[PDB]
Amino acid sequence: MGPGFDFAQAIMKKNTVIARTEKGEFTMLGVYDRVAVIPTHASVGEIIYINDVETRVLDACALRDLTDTNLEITIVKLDRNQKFRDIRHFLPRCEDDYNDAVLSVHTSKFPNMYIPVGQVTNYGFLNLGGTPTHRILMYNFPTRAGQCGGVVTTTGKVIGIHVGGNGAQGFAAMLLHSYFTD
């Protein structure tokens, strides 16, 4: 409808795949080369389905901060025959608050979904499903099941991936440029 949705659509149409694990279908953001991210609770194994094609996982790393606290981001390298558009220059360098964000989802169940979630708070600590978690972003939208891995953007920035909700608020894990240096 507007420049927020324009940027979100541009990211969804080139930098997402549908990831299936034994724990469900997830929106999966490709970042560069064959490297993508997914919430850690997807429990990635040695094999994953990518757009319903059996795909070997070459590496998977569940990120934790330097206090050894869960970040809820898993970085996956896929044995795919094609690279993602490199979007690392759209990642923020530092923890921050944001205005006017969009949460975008693409699964079998929720294709072409875009939600204007509004103001995003640097919330920080969250007890996420019993697990102490750092670097959490919060937005005041009643997010539901199946939206996990959905991409949080502002105009010009890819800032996080949706990892949870409490029925009234939704929570995302930060994406930082420093996660994807090579």
Ligand SMILES: CCn1ccc(CNC)n1
């Ligand atoms: C079944 C109709 N419906 C309303 C919202 C949604 C998806 N959640 C954002 N689905």
